[PDB]
Amino acid sequence: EFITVARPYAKAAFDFAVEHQSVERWQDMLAFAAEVTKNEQMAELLSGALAPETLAESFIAVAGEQLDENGQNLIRVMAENGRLNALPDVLEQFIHLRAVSEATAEVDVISAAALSEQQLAKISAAMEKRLSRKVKLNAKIDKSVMAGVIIRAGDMVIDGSVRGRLERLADVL
Amino acid sequence: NSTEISELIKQRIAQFNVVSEAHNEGTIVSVSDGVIRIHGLADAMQGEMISLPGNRYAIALNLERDSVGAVVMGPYADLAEGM
Amino acid sequence: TGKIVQVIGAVVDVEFPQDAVPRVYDALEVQNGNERLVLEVQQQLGGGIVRTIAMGSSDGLRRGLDVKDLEHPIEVPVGKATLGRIMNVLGEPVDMKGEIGEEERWAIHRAAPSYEELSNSQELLETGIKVIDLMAPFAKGGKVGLFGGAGVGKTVNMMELIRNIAIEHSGYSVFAGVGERTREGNDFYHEMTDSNVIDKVSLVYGQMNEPPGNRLRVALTGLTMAEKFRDEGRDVLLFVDNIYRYTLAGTEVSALLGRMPSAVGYQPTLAEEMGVLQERITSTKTGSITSVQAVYVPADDLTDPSPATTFAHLDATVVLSRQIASLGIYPAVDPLDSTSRQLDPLVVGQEHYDTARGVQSILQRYQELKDIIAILGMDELSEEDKLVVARARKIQRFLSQPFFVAEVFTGSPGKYVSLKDTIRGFKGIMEGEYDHLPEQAFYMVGSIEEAVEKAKKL
Amino acid sequence: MATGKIVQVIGAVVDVEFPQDAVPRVYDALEVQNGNERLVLEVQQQLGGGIVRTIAMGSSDGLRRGLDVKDLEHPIEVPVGKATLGRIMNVLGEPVDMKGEIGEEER
Numbered sequence: 040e041f042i043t044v045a046r047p048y049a050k051a052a053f054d055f056a057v058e059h060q061s062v063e064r065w066q067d068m069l070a071f072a073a074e075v076t077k078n079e080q081m082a083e084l085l086s087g088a089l090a091p092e093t094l095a096e097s098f099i100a101v102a103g104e105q106l107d108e109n110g111q112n113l114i115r116v117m118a119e120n121g122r123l124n125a126l127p128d129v130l131e132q133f134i135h136l137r138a139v140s141e142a143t144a145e146v147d148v149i150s151a152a153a154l155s156e157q158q159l160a161k162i163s164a165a166m167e168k169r170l171s172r173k174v175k176l177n178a179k180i181d182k183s184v185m186a187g188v189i190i191r192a193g194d195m196v197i198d199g200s201v202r203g204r205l206e207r208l209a210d211v212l
Numbered sequence: 213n214s215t216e217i218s219e220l221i222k223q224r225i226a227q228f229n230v231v232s233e234a235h236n237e238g239t240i241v242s243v244s245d246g247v248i249r250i251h252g253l254a255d256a257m258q259g260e261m262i263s264l265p266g267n268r269y270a271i272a273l274n275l276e277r278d279s280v281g282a283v284v285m286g287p288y289a290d291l292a293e294g295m
Numbered sequence: 296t297g298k299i300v301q302v303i304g305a306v307v308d309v310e311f312p313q314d315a316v317p318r319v320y321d322a323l324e325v326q327n328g329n330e331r332l333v334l335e336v337q338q339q340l341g342g343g344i345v346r347t348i349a350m351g352s353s354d355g356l357r358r359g360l361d362v363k364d365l366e367h368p369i370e371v372p373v374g375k376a377t378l379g380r381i382m383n384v385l386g387e388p389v390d391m392k393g394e395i396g397e398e399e400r401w402a403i404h405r406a407a408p409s410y411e412e413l414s415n416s417q418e419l420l421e422t423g424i425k426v427i428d429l430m431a432p433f434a435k436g437g438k439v440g441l442f443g444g445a446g447v448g449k450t451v452n453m454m455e456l457i458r459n460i461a462i463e464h465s466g467y468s469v470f471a472g473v474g475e476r477t478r479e480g481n482d483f484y485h486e487m488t489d490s491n492v493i494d495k496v497s498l499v500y501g502q503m504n505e506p507p508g509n510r511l512r513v514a515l516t517g518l519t520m521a522e523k524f525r526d527e528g529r530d531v532l533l534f535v536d537n538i539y540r541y542t543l544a545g546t547e548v549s550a551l552l553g554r555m556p557s558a559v560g561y562q563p564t565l566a567e568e569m570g571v572l573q574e575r576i577t578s579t580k581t582g583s584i585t586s587v588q589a590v591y592v593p594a595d596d597l598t599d600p601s602p603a604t605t606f607a608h609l610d611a612t613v614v615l616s617r618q619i620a621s622l623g624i625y626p627a628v629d630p631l632d633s634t635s636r637q638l639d640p641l642v643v644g645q646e647h648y649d650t651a652r653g654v655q656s657i658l659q660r661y662q663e664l665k666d667i668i669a670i671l672g673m674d675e676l677s678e679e680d681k682l683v684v685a686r687a688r689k690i691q692r693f694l695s696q697p698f699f700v701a702e703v704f705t706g707s708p709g710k711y712v713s714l715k716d717t718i719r720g721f722k723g724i725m726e727g728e729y730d731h732l733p734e735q736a737f738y739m740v741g742s743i744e745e746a747v748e749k750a751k752k753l
Numbered sequence: 754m755a756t757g758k759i760v761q762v763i764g765a766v767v768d769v770e771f772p773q774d775a776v777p778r779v780y781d782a783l784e785v786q787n788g789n790e791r792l793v794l795e796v797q798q799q800l801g802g803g804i805v806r807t808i809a810m811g812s813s814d815g816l817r818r819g820l821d822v823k824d825l826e827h828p829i830e831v832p833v834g835k836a837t838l839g840r841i842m843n844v845l846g847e848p849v850d851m852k853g854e855i856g857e858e859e860r
């Protein structure tokens with residue numbers, strides 16, 4: 040998957056967007072450049088052997104919205120190195136860098152029932168203590184959880200489910 | 213604003229006439245030592261005879277994700293990229 | 296549900312929805328023109344791509360074909376319904392008879408029996424063949440391997456062992472044709488039908504004709520039938536027509552599976568792939584498998600990885616030499632390289648053990664003299680060294696034997712030799728009881744009585 | 754008019770980019786100014802994207818990236834016939850004796 044080759048570009052675009060105070064636009068800009076990449080006929084062209092420049096200028100034409108001389112030049116760089124199919128992974132990494140820089144985390148919370156909201160006030164206040172970041176909740180109701188709740192944040196998990204605790208107990212043959 | 217962007221793209225591709233090859237048809241991408249790499253041929257099958265310009269064939273040995281690998285049943289040296 | 300996305304030789308990549316990706320070793324199915332092709336799943340790549348081997352010809356496959364996900368491994372008929380019929384790797388009937396009256400089907404991929412289940416046995420099994428049960432005798436429930444190069448006698452020897460063992464034995468038998476000649480499958484089938492012994496034998500054939508994927512899996516189809524008869528509590532004979540072809544079909548696909556080459560270009564998994572097959576061919580406290588395997592030796596190189604790995608798996612090993620076979624001594628067994636776990640004074644007893652070690656000592660000493668003799672000639676030897684040579688040459692000739700299956704070649708009638716006659720015979724030669732007979736007297740005579748009758752007419 | 758540009762030079766192996774609709778066929782001969790002498794290149798492979806790969810028929814030293822390349826549309830062509838007799842030539846058919854030009858009729 041493209042993640043490893045997308046990292047160098049994602050940093051440079053975010054760094055540049057910080058200097059020029061344009062991070063929001065750049066996000067909405069990369070969101071278009073990723074989406075044109077997903078179109079079928081455009082995809083065929085990208086898998087083709089068109090020389091970089093001829094590929095780039097035919098891409099840039101479709102990406103009309105792109106800020107000329109900044110967003111459009113970022114395409115020319117990626118076209119020299121044939122990374123254009125990585126654009127969906129150059130985005131999202133840009134969003135990750137942004138969320139780190141804005142000291143903000145999406146955190147997820149999965150339970151047998153819709154949580155009581157008052158509980159979510161406690162959970163968010165706890166997560167803002169566990170991690171020194173503002174925490175957006177987007178919790179879920181799930182049938183698999185017999186009772187209780189899972190808290191998931193980045194790649195750290197705190198299982199509070201009865202499902203997990205039974206299958207944690209069933210372990211001791 | 214997603215369904216709009218998708219539609220806009222579809223309109224803009226046409227406005228610029230960028231479009232696929234026909235099935236059963238393709239182009240030579242690279243040429244070396246009698247091995248041929250072809251882009252397109254979305255309907256080619258393993259072991260098919262691919263007719264080249266002139267009156268000669270290549271045999272499809274590999275159907276890669278992006279290309280067909282083929283070997284030329286004759287002189288190869290006159291073939292060129294983009295045939 | 297799936298889509299084909301690459302076709303490289305025998306290997307096909309299929310994409311599935313990420314909620315639905317097939318397990319490893321699942322069977323998939325795809326329509327290829329006017330026939331159905333099965334694919335077996337080997338690896339899960341990322342992103343719902345899965346990489347598979349075609350159980351049939353992959354020519355005519357397009358990209359973008361729809362693939363059906365069967366929820367199970369390759370499963371084959373087992374039990375008495377298979378007896379007397381010829382079946383394919385997929386467990387399909389290949390004789391022109393009707394469908395197989397299966398009651399049960401078993402997945403060809405299985406775990407070996409646990410360490411607690413295994414059983415020991417020391418019951419010596421007799422053979423017709425002077426050299427084999429003298430030099431490398433073997434037990435009921437053990438494994439035998441015939442190692443040799445191209446054209447040395449692996450099949451003819453296995454056909455005598457079938458004739459001798461599998462007709463004085465009373466239970467069922469399984470013969471697995473793995474990457475060998477189709478003519479020899481047909482020749483075998485008939486003489487089984489002409490002898491009316493066919494109804495005790497299940498036969499599975501995956502000959503060289505077939506595409507890689509068939510030659511790879513067909514050995515496991517054969518074991519899975521033999522494991523049903525063993526677990527039923529029977530005593531079973533399993534014959535494998537060439538085990539080397541299983542490893543070679545692994546070599547052919549391994550690069551297309553994307554695995555770095557090892558050693559002499561073998562797959563890196565060679566020892567695990569061989570071991571996971573070999574560990575299933577074991578006798579157990581519930582029931583027994585006696586096994587004979589032919590083992591082709593590429594370029595006669597016994598130090599090649601594929602032979603070298605096979606040697607640790609087996610209880611008796613008989614090594615066939617092109618250098619002997621070009622003398623026309625048959626069976627072309629090398630007694631200085633052939634060996635068995637059963638050549639032990641406790642199981643064989645002392646007379647047999649002493650006779651075998653005497654023969655081994657004289658023939659070794661003859662190898663030590665041959666480099667002197669080649670440059671100097673024999674006249675320079677000592678008068679005891681000349682007696683060692685004069686005996687060793689008689690020993691080499693007396694290891695020769697007429698075979699009932701070989702009558703079509705030599706014309707001469709075959710011989711079955713009791714173990715007692717072999718020990719008595721070789722013990723007499725080494726003691727010098729026969730030092731007055733010519734060498735020609737010993738070549739191709741069944742028993743030592745037959746040497747002295749041949750000597751009267753020279 | 755030269756239409757290619759050199760894009761790599763790794764010892765004797767020289768890669769040249771052409772416009773996509775102009776790629777040399779295999780064994781075609783190119784030439785370039787290696788300073789103050791013309792150097793011939795023979796085409797070995799057509800790679801993707803208009804890039805071609807060539808072996809230099811002379812010393813590779815002193816080539817820059819970005820030099821212009823003339824695509825002679827034939828293979829290497831050599832003089833033939835009676836005019837060649839008693840003359841020494843190199844592989845390019847150029848006289849290696851000092852004895853002036855070869856009075857060729859055909860190449």
Ligand SMILES: Nc1ncnc2c1ncn2[C@@H]1O[C@H](COP(=O)(O)OP(=O)(O)OP(=O)(O)O)[C@@H](O)[C@H]1O
Nearest residue numbers: 444445446447448449450451452625626698701704
């Ligand atoms: N005991 C024997 N008596 C006479 N001839 C023999 C004997 N054993 C082998 N031969 C000769 O060698 C030939 C080949 O033997 P066989 O087919 O068993 O070889 P193989 O080891 O199976 O070779 P391959 O690896 O090709 O299958 C026989 O056809 C016969 O000509």
Ligand SMILES: [Mg+2]
Nearest residue numbers: 449450451475
């Ligand atoms: Mg054989």
